[PDB]
């Protein structure tokens, strides 16, 4: 089916005037596979997935050199940003960046991304056309000019359409059977009385991969939405994910409520009820 | 594989 690769960067300054920390993490769908952390004597890119270990020393050095260079340049960027916003030395701030490529069912690129935030808020983003920028404010417009002068968009576009797609296809093949296998959710409905407003009907979905899922309660064949408690999709720790959705029901009316689950591993939505 | 940033790629 559809797949993506994403690199997440974090560059954050420390109090006073210490050396800012740069962290890079790489992801194929919901599977972390590399990490680099600049806070060490001799920092190196490290594998976080079995299927990347087979990559030779040259692959690892290329990563490390990119991330070591970024460590230095993202420091200058942090100084640039605290100038734009007239912020003082001490003084803790964060540049966040996410980029990468999405593949459709065919294996062809659907879209590329490059997105930056400053202190948790959208700052600058590469547009869908992979050739223009959307800047949040006048400070981001200064960044945009620098990046237009340096043809950042054109070089990112070349990366996203080639290198990004090429390597994502490699990891998908090398990591197939884990990356290219969709585990369907195991589902059940539990019943917990509470007397006042009667009972809870909780709809579970467990052990599914990837994380993307839809869980909704219907009453008489109608999306409830307003009075349904949705929990955040959470990792089980063994690479699978968990989610539940619960509603409060007037006891002996459980049978008019249905749970609905949509997932990549399910050929069609499951309609579920409470089993007495 | 990540992208390499050329010269003058600062924010």
């Amino acid at each position, epitope marked *: 089916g559809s797949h993506s690769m994403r690199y997440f960067y974090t560059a954050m300054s420390r109090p006073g005037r210490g050396e800012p920390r740069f962290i890079a993490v790489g992801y194929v769908d919901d599977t972390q596979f590399v990490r680099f952390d600049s806070d060490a004597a001799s920092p190196r890119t490290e594998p976080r997935a079995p299927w990347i270990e087979q990559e030779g020393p040259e692959y690892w050095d290329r990563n490390t050199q990119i991330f070591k260079t970024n460590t230095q340049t993202y420091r200058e960027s942090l100084r640039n940003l605290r100038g734009y916003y007239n912020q003082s030395e001490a003084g803790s701030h964060i540049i966040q960046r996410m980029y990468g490529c999405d593949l459709g069912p065919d294996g062809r690129l659907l879209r590329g991304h490059d997105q930056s935030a400053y202190d948790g808020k959208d700052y600058i983003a590469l547009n869908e056309d992979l050739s223009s920028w959307t800047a949040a404010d006048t400070a981001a417009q200064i960044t945009q000019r620098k990046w237009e002068a340096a043809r950042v968009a*054109e070089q990112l576009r*070349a990366y996203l359409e080639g290198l990004c797609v090429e390597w994502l296809r490699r990891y998908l093949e090398n990591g197939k059977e884990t990356l290219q296998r969709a585990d369907p959710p195991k589902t059940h409905v539990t019943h917990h009385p509470v007397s006042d407003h009667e009972a809870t009907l909780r709809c579970w979905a467990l052990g599914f991969y990837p994380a993307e899922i839809t869980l909704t309660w219907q009453r008489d064949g109608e999306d409830q939405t307003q009075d349904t408690e949705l929990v955040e999709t959470r990792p089980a720790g063994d690479r699978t994910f968990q989610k539940w959705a619960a509603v409060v029901v007037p006891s002996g009316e459980e049978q008019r409520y249905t749970c609905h689950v949509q997932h990549e591993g399910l050929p069609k939505p499951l309609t579920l009820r409470w089993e007495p | 594989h990540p992208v390499g940033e050329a010269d003058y790629f600062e924010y």
Partner: T-cell receptor, first 110, second 113 residues
Framework: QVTQSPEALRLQEGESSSLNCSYTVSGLRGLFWYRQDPGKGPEFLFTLYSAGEEKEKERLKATLTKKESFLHITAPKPEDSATYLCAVQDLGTSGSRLTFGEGTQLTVNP | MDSGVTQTPKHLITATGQRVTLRCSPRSGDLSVYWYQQSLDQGLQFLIHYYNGEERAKGNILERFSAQQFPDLHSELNLSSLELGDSALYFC??????????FGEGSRLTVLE
């Protein structure tokens, strides 16, 4: 990483030829052509970024494929005698460094 | 014609075991300096790269070779304990924001016994 052919070119005035530059790179940032006269530094000619891009200036025309670049010299004159240098930048490396071929030393017999 | 990059001295003749310093000013507005070496019957070889006073990347530069970028943005390349095989053309380039490298006119070194 960058291989140019032929090493030396011996053309007659008016005899067109095209100089090869083969490249292998993790991802192409930019392909460059330079001219270097004896006792001079490389002088900028062209930069090509994507497969199918062409650039032309007088007797010189540069094209780009996934695997190589060609510098076509049409009806060359004695003045065109020089070494023609090919170079590439890589998307997998930081900064803007060039990796050069060894060049094509062209002499045009008047 | 000339790019705008200034390289001196144009010519150096010296003895083996000696030390020389080459000078480079980038184009006005360029902040980077790249050093290259061209030996006879050999192409340009990347030595070392600076940006805005800071070392950025390193080629196959020998340990007895060293360089710096100053606040001026000008750069000095030092070659010490010179050997006959150090005889070469040494080129510096500065990069533009747009990506292109623009070269100086070179310093030619001849090392004699």
């Amino acid at each position: 990483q960058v291989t140019q052919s032929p090493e030396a070119l011996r053309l007659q005035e008016g005899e067109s030829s095209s100089l090869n530059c083969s490249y292998t790179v993790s991802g192409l940032r930019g392909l460059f052509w330079y001219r270097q006269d004896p006792g001079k530094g490389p002088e900028f000619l062209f930069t090509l970024y994507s497969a199918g891009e062409e650039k032309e200036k007088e007797r010189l025309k540069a094209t780009l494929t996934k695997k190589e670049s060609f510098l076509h010299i049409t009806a060359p004159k004695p003045e065109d005698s020089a070494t023609y240098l090919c170079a590439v930048q890589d998307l997998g490396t930081s900064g803007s460094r060039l990796t050069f071929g060894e060049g094509t030393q062209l002499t045009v017999n008047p | 014609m000339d790019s705008g990059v200034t390289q001196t001295p144009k010519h150096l003749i010296t003895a083996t075991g000696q030390r020389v310093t080459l000078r480079c000013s980038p184009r006005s507005g360029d902040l980077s300096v790249y050093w290259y070496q061209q030996s006879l019957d050999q192409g340009l070889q990347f030595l070392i790269h600076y940006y805005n006073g800071e070392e950025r990347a390193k080629g196959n530069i020998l340990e007895r070779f060293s360089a710096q970028q100053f606040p001026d943005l000008h750069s000095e390349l030092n070659l010490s304990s010179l050997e006959l095989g150090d005889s070469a053309l040494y080129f510096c380039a500065s990069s533009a924001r747009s990506g292109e490298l623009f070269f100086g006119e070179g310093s030619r070194l001849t090392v004699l016994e």
